[PDB]
Scaffold this active site. Sequence first.
Site, short mmCIF file in Angstrom:
data_model
loop_
_atom_site.label_atom_id
_atom_site.label_comp_id
_atom_site.label_asym_id
_atom_site.label_seq_id
_atom_site.Cartn_x
_atom_site.Cartn_y
_atom_site.Cartn_z
N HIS A 221 0.83 -1.20 0.00
CA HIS A 221 0.00 0.00 0.00
C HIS A 221 0.86 1.26 0.00
CE1 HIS A 221 -2.36 3.29 1.75
NE2 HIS A 221 -3.42 2.70 1.23
N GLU A 225 0.94 3.83 -3.24
CA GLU A 225 0.54 5.23 -3.14
C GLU A 225 1.68 6.15 -3.55
OE1 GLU A 225 -2.45 6.23 -2.74
OE2 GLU A 225 -3.22 4.20 -2.39
N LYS A 228 2.12 6.00 -7.33
CA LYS A 228 1.07 6.75 -8.02
C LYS A 228 1.40 8.24 -8.05
CE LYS A 228 -2.68 5.46 -5.82
NZ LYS A 228 -4.12 5.77 -5.58
N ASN A 229 1.86 8.79 -6.93
CA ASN A 229 2.19 10.21 -6.88
C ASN A 229 3.44 10.51 -7.70
OD1 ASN A 229 0.82 9.95 -3.76
ND2 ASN A 229 0.20 11.66 -5.07
O1 LIG Z 1 5.49 15.58 -6.84
C1 LIG Z 1 5.33 14.68 -6.03
C2 LIG Z 1 4.36 14.67 -4.84
C3 LIG Z 1 4.62 13.32 -4.24
C4 LIG Z 1 4.05 12.71 -3.14
C5 LIG Z 1 4.49 11.42 -2.80
C6 LIG Z 1 5.48 10.77 -3.57
C7 LIG Z 1 6.05 11.40 -4.68
C8 LIG Z 1 5.60 12.67 -4.99
N1 LIG Z 1 6.00 13.48 -6.03
#
Ligand SMILES: O=C1Cc2ccccc2N1
Lengths: 337, 337
Positions: A221, A225, A228-229
């Site tokens: 998880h 997540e 994905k970001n």
């Molecule tokens: O720009 C981003 C915002 C974020 C949150 C979590 C993980 C990677 C990233 N990259």
Amino acid sequence: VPREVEHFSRYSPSPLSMKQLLDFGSCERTSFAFLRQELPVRLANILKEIDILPTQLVNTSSVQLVKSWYIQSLMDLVEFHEKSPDDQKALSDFVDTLIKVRNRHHNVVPTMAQGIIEYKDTNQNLQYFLDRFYMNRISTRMLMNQHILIFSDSQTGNPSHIGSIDPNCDVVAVVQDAFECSRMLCDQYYLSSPELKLTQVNGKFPDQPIHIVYVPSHLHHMLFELFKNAMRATVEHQENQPSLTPIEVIVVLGKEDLTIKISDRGGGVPLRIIDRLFSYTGYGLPISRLYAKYFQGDLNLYSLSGYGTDAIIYLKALSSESIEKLPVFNKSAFKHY
Amino acid sequence: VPREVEHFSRYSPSPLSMKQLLCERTSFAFLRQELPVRLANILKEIDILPTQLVNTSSVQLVKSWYIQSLMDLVEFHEKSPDDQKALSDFVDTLIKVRNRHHNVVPTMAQGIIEYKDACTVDPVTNQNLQYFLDRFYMNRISTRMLMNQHILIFSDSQTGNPSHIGSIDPNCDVVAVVQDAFECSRMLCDQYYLSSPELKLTQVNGKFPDQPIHIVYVPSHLHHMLFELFKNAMRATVEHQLTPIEVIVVLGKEDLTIKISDRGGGVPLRIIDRLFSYYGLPISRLYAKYFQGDLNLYSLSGYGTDAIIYLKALSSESIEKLPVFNKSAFKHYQDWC
Ligand SMILES: O=C1Cc2ccccc2N1
Ligand SMILES: O=C1Cc2ccccc2N1
């Protein structure tokens, strides 16, 4: 609240280590004796904190449903306090009850999230409560599933796990799995996805595969997540570029720590607002950090605004030091509110 | 304490912005008020420290120096800002104060070390000491900043680089400072270890693509931060092993970010915070936070460490982060399992 809620909320939750959780699978009467007491205590602790929520939030049908579910599950479990651990039918009934409680709580997270959506129709107290509420659920689901997946006849889980714990968790394999899952979603939203550039360093045992005792579902998880970001940021920041830079992952095993750093070139986030990524509303990253901290780990973001972001997961490399991080309703918690 | 200390401690420090810092009569009237205010706030905070610490010759020296400087500055409240020799004498008094305070940092540190080594320190008192020292050293950073600005601009003899406004470079070549600070650490590294890692530097200007990275900043402060970080990164690289030190400088809309990466084996998360307990690294973080920046470390135990500096890219937002001895601070001196 019911007398049972008042009474059992007076106790503090008893955190377990992942080593102890493994030892339940090495015995059913011992897990039953613990859970029939610990689960009411944990449900009662969070039930007391639900009451001090803003009235417009607590009165939502969603929150009232969650409260009613937890109350009923608490009552279901307290029914077993009169039974003897040696009572085989009580142990079997107890497994059935945990399965019923698990299914009843299955939709707690989206129900609670729907409750917040109504309340909104930034709040530090709400962030404080949701961290605690969701950590509490993570812990109760963890405990109940450990008992179900070890002692039930039909719910066996993964054959290589003791309950939900993989004593030899192949971290890199979970990384690759979660990356593919995020990659499949990224391709659906953008018709392109960054590649994975993965490195691993076993400082504890050089050139040796990296394994630790961990809950692979929780690790999956967190990585899902974060990937994905990282992918969303990479594609969007480079959407005017003829190619996509890979996502660089390094998995490091140290003496005390298992560290995973995920690096993207997705333009980064200003330091002033990077914490907003962890505020609920958008429950992926906040819950991921709860998962990391649940067993004394952590999850941090360090961004270079205008370039990219580093996401770092810290996990304890020793199961004996992987101890539940649990919220407790007491004077301190009431003062935080 | 002396009357002047009590009087001026009742004032709250007035933080300035880089933009503000970037008329001798007006600067005279401000500093003759503000410097006593800032000295008086920290003097009062010294008085609530443990008695055995305050009674060390070191802390008594610091207190006596700060008191004398305050009295020297208060005498100028009897002079008119239109008095030419008063302005000239005031510069000489700032130079005298700067010389009197020249050894404050090691002197206070000696008192702390003497106190910790000789006396028992409860957990709360230990946390209070780090809290006090962060504030004491930030306070000094701020008084030294203000005094040096006045001296460098208005002194007849002690004027700084004409290309700078006082100690501020309105177009600070960040990359040049990074390179210089790296060589300084490199020279020290060679002398002790007979070898040093190389620098692999990258720069990305997200705010002005393909243009030089410049911000308004105090190059000396930036040099101090990078020098200390480079010393630790080079020490960790040579001892653990030479892999180069990778530095990336990024200019975003709001942030100037510098990330320094080494492969010196890293530090366990459990004890990485101890690197900022009490002096080069904690003071370096104070420098970064002085103008609303920050300095963080995130290490991969068994591989290496990343150090990241955040600086505000806008001078208007580069505002002094000053400690104030008010009810809230005194309260700090006075939920989860
Ligand atoms: O720009 C981003 C915002 C974020 C949150 C979590 C993980 C990677 C990233 N990259
Ligand atoms: O191992 C280490 C410890 C440290 C502190 C500051 C900067 C870099 C490093 N590397």
